[PDB]
């Protein structure tokens, strides 16, 4: 019932190549590819109506797209450069000019060296004893650092349930070094809630790393896609 | 803007006595260099400058196909705006669209524009931010809504920032004396 895009996240070495694919809504005949760079913007790339190109702009000659018999279109991307690291969206209107329906988008990051890909390090620190005594409002800081590239999605899980109320994750990852980023998020909890030793707090960080197809030189574990979390229980004092 | 490339699009409607006279005219800087005209015995994109006379032969087929598509697209709009404004089906009308980009000495886009006009009065236009529309009346609010749900702003922006500048840079190279 919605536009499907795959894959959601890929890490490719500079000069490599990978294909992005997009399944439009059934019956839709107008597909259009948009690219959005890391700096907030939206760039029109290509428009294909009824299996043929209709309008083109900003689409490099290195990229080639084409519709198929089932109207699904794929984007061939070759000779990848670091500047190609961006998010690629796929809208599919029924007819040209009709309301378009976007897809989830594909997060492509082109890296110089695949060895620099490294999973994060997640650790959360309990609220300060000073603040809880004065404000009765505990703040739980979570620190995920040492990862590359910027393919993390942090979420909070209290009592086994994902919660959006009270959390305040940093908007962007802060790059510490050339090949290591760091993200911080803090969840506020009332002192009476945090002081209950029965409440389980968990800050998980989903990391989208190398694919299985991508070869890995041994001597170290492959930085495959994975979510690691640091948990802590409520404390009473 | 030392160098600009514009396009004037006119779709004069005649309800009876035939079909709408449709024609496109372009000006590198302020000199006309290409032209289309529906009311020709065998209409084709024709050059109006010596430097355009030598252009690629496949270029003329690419643009002539595009015009006939725009001709059919504007034939539907003429009918649509009779339904928007609740106008009679037997009155002559005119849609004027001017599209163009002017670039400075540095070769980067100074300002891009696209001004629609129905029967002399401004209808809709693309703002200076190249992302938002500015509609002039209630019906233009309907068209503005369509282009927003359709994503026309991103498509048109990519034309003025990209396609228009590259081909203007290409036209000026042809234009200089061989």
């Amino acid at each position: 019932s919605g536009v499907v895009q795959s894959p959601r996240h890929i890490i490719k070495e500079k000069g490599g190549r990978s294909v992005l694919t997009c399944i439009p809504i059934s019956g839709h005949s107008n597909v259009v590819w948009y690219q959005q760079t890391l700096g907030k913007e939206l760039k029109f790339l290509i428009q294909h109506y009824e299996k043929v190109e209709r309008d083109k702009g900003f689409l490099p000659c290195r990229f080639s797209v084409q519709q198929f018999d089932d109207y699904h279109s794929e984007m061939n991307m070759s000779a990848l450069e670091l500047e190609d690291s961006a998010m690629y969206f796929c809208a599919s209107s029924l007819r040209w000019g009709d309301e378009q329906y976007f897809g989830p988008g594909t997060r492509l990051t082109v890296v110089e060296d695949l060895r620099n890909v490294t999973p994060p390090k997640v650790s959360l620190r309990e609220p300060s004893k000073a603040e809880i005594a004065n404000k009765q409002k505990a703040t739980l800081q979570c620190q995920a650092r040492g990862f590359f590239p910027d393919h993390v999605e942090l979420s909070w899980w209290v009592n086994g349930k994902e919660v959006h109320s009270g959390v305040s994750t940093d908007p962007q990852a802060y790059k510490e070094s050339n090949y290591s980023y760091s993200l911080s998020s803090r969840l506020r909890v009332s002192a009476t809630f945090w002081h209950n030793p029965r409440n389980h707090f968990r800050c998980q960080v989903q990391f989208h790393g190398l694919s299985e197809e991508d070869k890995w030189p041994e001597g170290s574990p492959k930085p495959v896609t994975q979510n690691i979390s640091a948990e802590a229980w409520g404390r009473a004092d | 803007g030392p160098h600009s490339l514009r396009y004037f699009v006119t779709a004069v409607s005649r309800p009876g006595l035939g079909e709408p006279r449709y024609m496109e005219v372009g000006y590198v800087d302020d000199t006309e260099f290409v032209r289309f005209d529906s009311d020709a015995e065998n209409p084709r994109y024709e050059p109006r400058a010596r430097w355009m006379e030598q252009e690629c032969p496949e270029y003329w087929e690419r643009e002539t196909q595009k015009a006939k598509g725009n001709e059919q697209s504007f034939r539907v709009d003429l009918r649509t705006l009779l339904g928007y404004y609740n106008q009679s089906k037997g009155g002559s009308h005119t849609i004027q669209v001017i599209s163009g980009c002017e670039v400075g000495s540095d070769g980067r886009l100074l300002r891009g524009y696209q001004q629609y006009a129905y029967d002399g009065q401004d209808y809709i236009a693309l703002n200076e931010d190249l992302k938002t529309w500015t509609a002039a009346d209630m019906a233009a609010l309907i068209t503005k809504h369509k282009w927003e749900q359709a994503g026309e702003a991103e498509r048109l922006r990519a034309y003025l920032e990209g396609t228009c500048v590259e081909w203007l840079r290409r036209y000026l190279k042809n234009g200089n004396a061989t």
């Binding site: 000019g97 | 396009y7 372009g26 643009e63 725009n70 697209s73 649509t80 696209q114 369509k146």
Partner: peptide
Amino acid sequence: RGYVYQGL
């Protein structure tokens, strides 16, 4: 080149 005008 010229814009590919679509419906309004």
